[PDB]
Design a protein around this ligand. Structure first.
Ligand SMILES: Nc1ncnc2c1ncn2[C@H]1C[C@H](O)[C@@H](COP(=O)(O)NP(=O)(O)OP(=O)(O)O)O1
Ligand SMILES: [Mg+2]
Ligand SMILES: [Mg+2]
Length: 425
DNA sequence: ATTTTGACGCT
């Protein structure tokens, strides 16, 4: 009763860009706007691999991971934009720079945690408290929430339903109680509307957002009404929402651990987890996972929004599939150099922009035949931003993987260089 | 022969 926490202490949002790389290319090239279109990497093999897909193209069944040649069979008028290639490899600079544009706008509203190239969590608890004091007991108008859905409502056309639900929600709010979690979430949603409007005004990019009491629910909420909408998931919405929510839809449960929860417990939906004790869950999934599941299935999570706007590592990777695997010393050294040159460029820019220097270089390879993604992953000192030195050091750290009696055996199917362990500069 | 990343957990 009175002593059981309900995980309603924070307001957390997750903002995620809609079909991000596609919007970057559509801003650049107006001919692609409002069209079925996709972003691809490479072009020779089956037209290139798709990494982002506009919503118009998704209506035809185009998805990420599809070869463009196959996507064209589903959507003959599909337009394509190709990722830049530099030094023989895909170069994602344009998208990293566009991400910085968006993150810098979001950071004006609150401290953000960069969760990926196109999404960030926001802890709005303080901003909501400030806005609630500003409002001075004033009711919140539906006009302040023009793109907000309230999950679970209405109860008891698309835009018509959205407005019905929002009206039910606002009608039910206790505006004069500044500690009401539902009121706090609603003010959070007002702020997120302002943030999303700022992003669109200042970059041209549209996005979706989730507003809830924690990161997992905010992330889940964000996807419920993509694109170009935001969704509020209240604590009270959790039992119904989770009662038919596949376990795999919750962040971190989309892989092996989620599969094991389903198999071991004989359940399908997140809400079914409430029928196990914390000790039972810890017994099957470990102390950490068990406690996390016990709270999460009740809508409770405590993972903080970490104050981190910049990536913690800077890496460069290339696969060499099938017959393109690297089989000569000259090939291996040339490609290590290419990767190191891109890495040097990004590191030098990072040092100038962000007042830090990486101190460790991680080298990873895969050998043809090896079932593992990586055959070797070894570190060495990163003491100077110099591509020839980094490539020589990477070769030094991997040369013993070569069985060859000038020849490289087994052929290499992947090279990877990653700068880590940043210090202030 | 989707690829190119990037955060975090385990031992
Ligand atoms: N498997 C992959 N490999 C490479 N790049 C990828 C990728 N998945 C995504 N990206 C890149 C390309 C993506 O544009 C970007 C963000 O990924 P999302 O947020 O998961 N998907 P999007 O924003 O496109 O659509 P929406 O969120 O509206 O559903 O990351
Ligand atoms: Mg996105
Ligand atoms: Mg995303």
């Amino acid at each position: 009763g009175p002593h059981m926490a309900t995980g309603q202490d924070r307001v957390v949002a997750l903002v995620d860009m809609d079909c991000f790389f596609v919007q970057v290319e559509q801003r650049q090239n107006p001919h692609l706007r409002n069209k079925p279109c996709a972003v691809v990497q490479y072009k020779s093999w089956k037209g290139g691999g798709i990494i982002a897909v506009s919503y118009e193209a998704r209506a035809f069944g185009v998805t990420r991971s599809m070869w463009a040649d196959d996507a064209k069979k589903l959507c003959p008028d599909l337009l394509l934009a190709q990722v830049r290639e530099s030094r023989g490899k895909a170069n994602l600079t344009k998208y990293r720079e566009a991400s910085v544009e968006v993150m810098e706008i979001m950071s004006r509203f609150a401290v953000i945690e960069r969760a990926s190239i196109d999404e960030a969590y926001v802890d709005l608890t303080s901003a909501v408290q400030e806005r609630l004091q500003k409002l001075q007991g004033q009711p919140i108008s539906a006009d302040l929430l023009p793109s907000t859905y309230i999950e679970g409502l209405p109860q008891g056309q698309k835009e018509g339903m959205r407005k019905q639900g929002l009206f039910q929600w606002l009608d039910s709010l206790q505006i004069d109680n500044l500690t009401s979690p539902d009121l706090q979430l609603t003010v959070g949603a007002v702020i997120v509307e302002e943030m999303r409007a700022a992003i669109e005004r200042e970059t041209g990019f549209q996005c979706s957002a989730g507003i809830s009491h924690n990161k997992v629910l905010a992330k889940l909420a964000c996807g419920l009404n993509k694109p170009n909408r935001q969704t509020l998931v209240s604590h009270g919405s959790v039992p119904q929402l989770f009662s038919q929510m596949p376990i795999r839809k919750i962040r971190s449960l989309g892989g092996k651990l989620g599969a094991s929860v389903i198999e071991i417990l004989g359940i399908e939906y997140m809400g079914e987890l409430t029928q196990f004790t914390e000790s039972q869950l810890q017994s099957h999934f470990g102390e950490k996972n068990g406690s996390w599941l016990y709270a999460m299935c009740r809508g409770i999570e405590h993972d903080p929004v970490k104050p981190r706007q910049l990536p913690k590592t800077i890496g460069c990777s290339k696969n060499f599939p099938g017959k393109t695997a690297l089989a000569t010393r000259e090939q291996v050294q040339w490609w290590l150099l290419q990767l190191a040159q891109e890495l040097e460029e990004r590191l030098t820019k990072d040092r100038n922009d962000n007042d830090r220097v990486a101190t460790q270089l991680v080298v990873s390879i895969r050998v043809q035949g090896d079932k593992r993604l990586s055959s070797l992953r070894r570190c060495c000192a990163l003491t100077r931003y110099d591509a020839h030195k980094m490539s020589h050091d990477a070769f030094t750290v991997i040369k013993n993987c070569n069985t060859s009696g000038t020849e490289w055996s087994p052929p290499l199917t992947m090279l990877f260089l990653c700068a880590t362990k940043f210090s202030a500069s």
